[PDB]
Amino acid sequence: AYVINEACISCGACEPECPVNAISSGDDRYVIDADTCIDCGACAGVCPVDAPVQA
Ligand code: SF4
Ligand code: SF4
Numbered sequence: 001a002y003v004i005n006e007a008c009i010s011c012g013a014c015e016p017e018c019p020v021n022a023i024s025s026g027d028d029r030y031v032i033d034a035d036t037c038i039d040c041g042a043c044a045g046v047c048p049v050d051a052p053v054q055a
Contacts, residue, residue, distance in 0.1 A: 018042060
């Protein structure tokens with residue numbers, strides 16, 4: 001799983017780009033569904049602040 005850390009500025013750019021729709025808007029920051037994430041790294045590639053990190 002990747003997890004979006006506290007650097008997220010809630011820009012929303014990563015949500016459309018997840019190939020398996022694992023990202024949604026949450027309170028404070030966006031959230032990854034760890035039961036769907038397949039570690040592709042796409043969200044980190046479109047993140048301006050590089051908040052998604054592999055855990
Ligand atoms: S790593 Fe890939 S599968 Fe996991 S949330 Fe980011 S874009 Fe979606
Ligand atoms: S692209 Fe980065 S800052 Fe923008 S919502 Fe996704 S994780 Fe947060």
